[PDB]
Amino acid sequence: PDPSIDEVSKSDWDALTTQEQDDIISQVENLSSTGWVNTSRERKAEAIRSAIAERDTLYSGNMSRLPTLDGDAEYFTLYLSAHKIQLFEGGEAQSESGEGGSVSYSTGGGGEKDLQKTRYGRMALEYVWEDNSIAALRTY
């Protein structure tokens, strides 16, 4: 996209053209083979706007004078977006069964924090020190 998802804050996202938003949405839709085609535009836009806001608030600033977001901020925001889109539908699929036949995914077995609950969450989690508390400070 022309503006990248890491180049925009919440107020910037609201200031984008519909085309620039749709380009970013189209990038997020690459992260699933299903593309989430049965969820409407407004909900994917809300998830992205939320991911932007949550990055800028919960995953910003320094920790032992390292950035708290160590990985690529583009892909972090995309994975955080995909995580939110997934949670706008349900959990991870543990099992899916059709008119006939079935598949099951071993998507469980992780911890209890939100990011631990889904595949996109578990990817995003690596970009941000795995939520580890490595901060340090001193008297001067």
């Binding site: 989430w36 969820t39 409407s40 407004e42 539908e89 349900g90 069964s97 059709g98």
Partner: protein, 156 residues
Amino acid sequence: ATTSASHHVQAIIDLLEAAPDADWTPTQTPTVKRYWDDAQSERGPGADMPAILYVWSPTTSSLDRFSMDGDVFDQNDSIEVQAWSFDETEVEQLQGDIVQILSEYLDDNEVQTPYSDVAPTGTNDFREQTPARTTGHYIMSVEVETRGLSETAKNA
């Protein structure tokens, strides 16, 4: 003319897609899909989206000998069309609509379709299955059968 499709599932998708917007009862024309277009956790429409019809063949197509020339099978094909929506009345309207749409072509002598006969043969209601606490899809279906003379190349 309207379809000329290679297989019954594509043929009925083409018939439902060919229907004018005015022939659908709701405000929005439904989306028509193969059953296998969507993953299970995402099956059915989201809110604010148009309703979804899923088409597939649930049982064995019969091939019967038409005559002892052997040029042709009397072919009988089976399809189900499932309507998914959050609105209990919309699925009921869609069932009416699907029956109406597919009640054209009832004795099409291979003019529109590659068949002698496309017919709704039964309908199902599954609204009783939807749990009342949760928002969740209502489902109803049309069972459709489809008959024609299918060439064998026995005699070239």
